[PDB]
Ligand binder design. Sequence first.
Ligand code: PPE
Ligand code: PPE
Ligand code: PPE
Ligand code: PPE
Ligand code: PPE
Ligand code: PPE
Lengths: 297, 298, 301, 305, 298, 294
Amino acid sequence: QIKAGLIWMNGAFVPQEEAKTSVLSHALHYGTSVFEGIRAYETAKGPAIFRLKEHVKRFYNSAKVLRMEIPFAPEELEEAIKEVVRRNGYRSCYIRPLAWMGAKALGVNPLPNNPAEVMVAAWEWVRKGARLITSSWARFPANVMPGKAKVGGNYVNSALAKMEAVAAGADEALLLDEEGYVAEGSGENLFFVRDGVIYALEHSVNLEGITRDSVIRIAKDLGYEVQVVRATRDQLYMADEVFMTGTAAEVTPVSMIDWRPIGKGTAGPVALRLREVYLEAVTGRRPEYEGWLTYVN
Amino acid sequence: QIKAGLIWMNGAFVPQEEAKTSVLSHALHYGTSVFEGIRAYETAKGPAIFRLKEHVKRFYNSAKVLRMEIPFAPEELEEAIKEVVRRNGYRSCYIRPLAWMGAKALGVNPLPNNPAEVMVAAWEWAVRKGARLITSSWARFPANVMPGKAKVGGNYVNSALAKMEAVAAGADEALLLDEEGYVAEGSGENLFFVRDGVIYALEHSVNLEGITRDSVIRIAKDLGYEVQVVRATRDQLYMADEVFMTGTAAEVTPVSMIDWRPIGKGTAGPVALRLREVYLEAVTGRRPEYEGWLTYVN
Amino acid sequence: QIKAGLIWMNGAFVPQEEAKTSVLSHALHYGTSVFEGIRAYETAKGPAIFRLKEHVKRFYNSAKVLRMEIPFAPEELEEAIKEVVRRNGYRSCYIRPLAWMGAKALGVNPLPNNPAEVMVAAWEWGAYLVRKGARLITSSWARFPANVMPGKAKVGGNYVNSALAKMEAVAAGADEALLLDEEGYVAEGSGENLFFVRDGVIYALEHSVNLEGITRDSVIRIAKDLGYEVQVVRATRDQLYMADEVFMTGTAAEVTPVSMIDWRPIGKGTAGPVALRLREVYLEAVTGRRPEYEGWLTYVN
Amino acid sequence: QIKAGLIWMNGAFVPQEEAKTSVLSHALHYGTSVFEGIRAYETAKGPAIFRLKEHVKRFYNSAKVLRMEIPFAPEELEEAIKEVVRRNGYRSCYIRPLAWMGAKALGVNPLPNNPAEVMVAAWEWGAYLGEEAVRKGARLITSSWARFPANVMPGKAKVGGNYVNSALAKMEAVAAGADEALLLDEEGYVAEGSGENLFFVRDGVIYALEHSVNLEGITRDSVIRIAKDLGYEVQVVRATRDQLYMADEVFMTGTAAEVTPVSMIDWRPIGKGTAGPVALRLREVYLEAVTGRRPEYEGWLTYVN
Amino acid sequence: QIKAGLIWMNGAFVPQEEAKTSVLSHALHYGTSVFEGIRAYETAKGPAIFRLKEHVKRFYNSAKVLRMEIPFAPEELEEAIKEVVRRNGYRSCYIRPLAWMGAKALGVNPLPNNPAEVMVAAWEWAVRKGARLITSSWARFPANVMPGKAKVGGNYVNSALAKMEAVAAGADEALLLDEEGYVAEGSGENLFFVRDGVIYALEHSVNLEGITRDSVIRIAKDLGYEVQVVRATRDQLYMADEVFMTGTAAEVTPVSMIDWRPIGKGTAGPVALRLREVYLEAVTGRRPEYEGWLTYVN
Amino acid sequence: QIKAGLIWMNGAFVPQEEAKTSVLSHALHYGTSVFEGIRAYETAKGPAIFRLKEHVKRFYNSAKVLRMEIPFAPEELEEAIKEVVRRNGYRSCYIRPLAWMGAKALGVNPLPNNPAEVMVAAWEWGARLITSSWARFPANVMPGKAKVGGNYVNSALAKMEAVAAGADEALLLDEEGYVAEGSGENLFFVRDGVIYALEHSVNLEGITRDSVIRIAKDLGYEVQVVRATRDQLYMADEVFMTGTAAEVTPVSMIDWRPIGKGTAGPVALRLREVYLEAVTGRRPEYEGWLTYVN
Ligand SMILES: Cc1[nH+]cc(COP(=O)(O)O)c(CN[C@@H](CCC(=O)O)C(=O)O)c1O
Ligand SMILES: Cc1[nH+]cc(COP(=O)(O)O)c(CN[C@@H](CCC(=O)O)C(=O)O)c1O
Ligand SMILES: Cc1[nH+]cc(COP(=O)(O)O)c(CN[C@@H](CCC(=O)O)C(=O)O)c1O
Ligand SMILES: Cc1[nH+]cc(COP(=O)(O)O)c(CN[C@@H](CCC(=O)O)C(=O)O)c1O
Ligand SMILES: Cc1[nH+]cc(COP(=O)(O)O)c(CN[C@@H](CCC(=O)O)C(=O)O)c1O
Ligand SMILES: Cc1[nH+]cc(COP(=O)(O)O)c(CN[C@@H](CCC(=O)O)C(=O)O)c1O
């Protein structure tokens, strides 16, 4: 079981055992929910939530894609997110906001079910490099599933790929789009390095990662040249380095893809350095990035 | 609110109010659930569930796709489905079995959450004018993106988007095309068209293998119609003598217009209407040759 | 120049020189027209139009796709089609019915331009009545997906794709172009449907993104009547390269044996026995020499 | 009916009633024609045609795609385009040059029909002095018709046949209650409107869509230059429908559309739900440019008087 | 090392050691070769080659695709194939005929290199528990990218990549999907599935028109099975009662699992096992009805 | 026949007639080989191999895609490549390194056949294009970033088609309809003074393409990397191809439609001249790209 503790349920905190919803909820049957992944890191000045406003903005943006109505103002949700950390006495934790279509009706159309129900829960929270395998499941085309949003149903595609990779003996799955180009990991964005240049993948059908965005800024600040391009699986095979970014994965070096060693076959210097500086940034050690932090105290 | 009444929750019936699950359930966050749609009709011999066996079989098959483990034998679920009708005193109703990944963990990989939790709920459940459809701007998922042969919760985000669009456009239902441009299926039903006396069922492609579609093809052949299974384009439908949809909820529904273009005479056609009539006769227990499709609750 | 003669213009015949339309016509700028291609053959009983009703039905079906309103009943157009042959004294000829959006406005939306203007013209064709076989070349232009252009209708704009393919084929030294769909499978010729024969079996291609040819339909019925097994399938270019025979069908092409594709000889390298036989029977049918196919003919006199 | 007046027909102007062609013209049957869309605006120095040479260049480029021969030097067409404005006494008008394959033959191959016949027509265009419609923003709906792949129809050319695709999408959108259609390419990415190019704005940055299978808009080009001149950062990217749904602003550009703010797509409000400050500003400066009020953009204007 | 023995080289047999070609051969650089896979089985009347004529016909058909010229008459190759078996004293063996572009030049265009050089080699020649497959991340080539109806050397880079992936993942074979997401074929075999007693062969799509597939369909029909040819998705296979592959080397091989999802009972099924056994009886000369498919070497 | 002379075979030079391999070699049956194309030009200081380091790196990168093991260190291959020029007395030549899967087994899986066999041979060394009916392979069908033997069946089919159609070279589109590359060259086009290099997409990352971009930028030309359609090329002021063998080749016509003036344009001609000056060691700023054999 998950140790969440007090959970914010539509305006008020309640014990975990009470945070329940009808099994007739539209989202439990049709994947009609949206969520976010936000982290808080321990700093010298107490817990700090990383880029809270960008994550909340995306939460509401994801809802707009489903024409879902969130019956709370962003400011309220932001307060609830800060409270779920305080009330549970968390320091380093992962925060999971969730908006879903309730049980007013079960016709496939979700509009009659508005406004959505909302909740916020949270729980306490490489050298060799991660091993990836390209999935047999293609990332959804942009006119099939809304890839720029974190819609529950989207993750069926992520789930299928993740299970496949794990079953194949790898750590994570790398999905290609329907055209054969690299898209993203089941829950991460991808980058590769070649001849000193850092290449971030275009958005294509992927989620516009906030970690990806953060990584790019940091890389440029450190003096690296950054290019945004479309990439094939063999451009990664031949890269000096490859790494993934994501709220949970932070910056994760990738040492192998499809049993083919990337560069030296272990985490490379660029990825390790980016990961380290990113960690310094989220823990409040870089004044230049203080704007990204929200201290709960 | 939905008037379901007593709901079967993992082996036992409980009041609708007690039928709840954690908001940390994997399926609530990642669309990792499977469900079925089954109907019971009133007959002179009491309520009869239509093709219960095929529906339960597909329920388990859908789970297989997600590598989801349903901790109950098919027979148990079948008894539960009959009892949800009995205990609630239903005659004409829609039955909704649901299997979903619980709250053991929230990593995207659902395997650690097995076995799945299960519940069965049910609730009491123009035509000549014909239904009006509009082709959706959302394409049906390719066979290597989402498992279209299964009724996986997440799949219905695609259906929901198309349905909302169709309704917002003033139509009754959406018609989705696959990514290559061919007709696929409705947001919740299969498609057929008729041309020069020949009935054309659409290939399975990326669609669900409808049980109503299956029933309709058998009925059509029994009535003596030639049936061909083909791939179809939107303009083949525009030029057809008739078009109709099939589905557990839609039964056999004639389609009189698509994209503001009238189909044939612009109203329900004779073939679709005959198939609908025989189908209704079958599900209400008035066709001896199709009694094998019914499961009498009493 | 085209020797059309008397042309039916929205209800009445006028000399060719008078059959004109404004250069501001919607169809001249946006390809918003639909047309048909119908052949009339000289028979022992005078000119006979081949499957007139099927063509007229398709003409109206094509208009339906563009939400184009044709201000004439099918019966009126069929009478006009018969009359264009008679009034010009034609025997064997090609008939070109055309409906186009007029000059009421030039907004891209054609609806405000309804109803469409209509005309029926015809000219002598096939004044004389292959063994070497036609040479095809696979085009670099793909036949339009079914959600890009309405391939089941004969919409004017559709033929830009056909025109591009045909020019390419001729420039490459071939007789006709063979287009593939966007997925890579064989679709149809720039203006014909395709068939192939392998081990005695006749394979007609599925409709996919192609026009449902009336000649294709006729050839299939003829093949079955002759006792041939006919299968409808999806095909790749190399399935054709390896076939014993390949042939095209179309109102203008009739039944044309294909002896070479992409410089690779098909079977024996010349027209095969099956295609030649189907062609002979088809020609006997259209010229009124087959009682079993009289239903397909409409004698003008 | 269209009030065109005197029309330039293959070298000479004729009354509208006489500007006709045979119903056996190749282009009337097979969409084998090319055309342009050019605007003339009133200025303190009389009517000014916007980016005439760029439009004429595209006209001849479109013909090249069809292997169509235009039997007139670009200099002649440009003069005819000027004369069509003068002769008809127009101030604010839309100009429609057209080149189509004639009636020499009706084989699908158009080569035998060369050279193409040509005409230049024009009609008054009402100037908009209001603001409510503009500030309310246009409503778009994503079409069920995909924009043609680059190996199906030549999307960089203004070929008549191409517009069957645009027409089907426009009718659909209008029937759905929207003002315009937004077409996606076969892969699912945003392409362009039935007759406009698309842009979106996010966090102060202007994003122009890549050319992909779309027409390379001359208005799009002008808008990008204006934006850069005003100090905005402009990026060229590929976009999905949901990137537009969550953008701060979305707007269309086109000779007829000028710069049109888009406030809603698929019933989902864009940003504030009305025209945004960025699109409104670009429209403002664009209009000042075509009306001869921006000295820095005078090179784009051709005065007829 | 491969124990081939005497190899037929452009007209005459030579010791294996002498069966070599220039490293400047066009086919070694650009995949411009064609080949066949033919089997001989031991019968009561000595070695018998299975459907030699069809295989030779396909050999020349494949060459036609590359505009490759085989400087030998089919009858000559057929004799060479029979001789590679008897001169080596083989009973049960696999025969590999090969035609490749030589070292006349190395421009990518192979026409200047005609005619092709040809050789015929042969060597002495899962089913119990069923094979385990995994869907590849490499899509089968579209019909306008590589000629899938021909056995062109270059094509097998796609097969090789898929097979390596499947083996590295712990499976026996790879199942490739086409670019659209539908099931295509194995890296070296065709696919079939069984549902409710009905046998479903997959359409040719972008796959090779297998001779074993052809044989299997005829046998299945002769045995009274209903056989349908269709387009299939991965989940249609997941939900099938049985799945099996066919190929010259694979013969008829039952598939008990795909992507770690058990097929039906999770072991070789009865239909696949029966088709395999009847096929073996046919190739070993025990079924008079299929004698026409055999070419006795003695 | 090819006048190659002495060929480096797995560590040692041997006469051409002795450079042979078993007809049972995996690569001869399944296209499982990788190769390179390298040129040496005459200079005032003797023969110079152009960007040897980059070609060798790509060679090993190509093998990785097939999970092919090359039993020699890159430094060893470099020496062999230089030696093949020396020992044959070559000045202006084309060098063809090749690694292929041998005859240990003929199962489709190449792994059991490792390590690969390797050889290095060499021999003394506007355009009209036509768009091919064969599409360049998608990135999940064949590894387009590597020079794998099997990949060239697609190139061979397109080249034969172009030549049969009367053209000099074939222009392939990807499955989506966009321009990809030539059967053996990369493509660029010019419009209003701006040079447009095509994105890598499913193409090979040409070393000549890379060199041309640097040259262009040094000359002051603005260079943009974009995706392109066939009609963008039809409407361009110029079009040209780049490749080790093709160097910088102007394209005057595509699909019988003249490009711009219909003859080689000014930009392509200047890039060609600077490139030729560079490879022949007449450009000090580009000397880093040359490896002198003597
Ligand atoms: C498909 C997907 N792509 C990219 C990302 C990376 O985006 P960002 O987090 O904004 O940099 C994420 C979040 N991946 C979540 C994984 C869920 C888990 O608990 O595991 C995350 O990091 O919350 C995705 O789900
Ligand atoms: C995508 C889909 N396609 C086809 C069908 C038709 O299949 P069948 O029901 O076996 O004949 C259904 C069930 N559509 C469900 C929608 C009902 C609802 O209220 O939601 C149904 O009929 O249960 C689908 O969801
Ligand atoms: C794209 C197309 N495909 C198939 C056919 C064959 O259909 P059918 O004619 O019904 O059997 C035709 C008619 N081709 C007309 C135009 C050719 C011409 O220019 O002439 C025709 O034969 O009238 C087509 O235009
Ligand atoms: C498909 C298309 N796309 C983009 C554009 C925008 O391009 P530009 O005008 O060069 O900036 C146009 C011109 N749309 C013409 C016709 C539509 C109308 O009638 O209005 C136009 O605006 O003249 C198009 O037709
Ligand atoms: C791609 C492919 N598909 C289907 C087949 C099956 O076709 P058939 O053999 O005609 O029924 C084969 C032959 N696969 C050869 C590989 C064996 C080997 O690796 O050795 C075979 O069975 O000879 C293929 O290579
Ligand atoms: C498909 C392909 N694409 C692009 C290129 C250009 O890359 P580069 O050489 O690194 O700039 C080459 C090399 N073409 C080789 C083969 C041609 C030949 O057969 O000769 C070459 O030029 O060596 C290719 O084979």
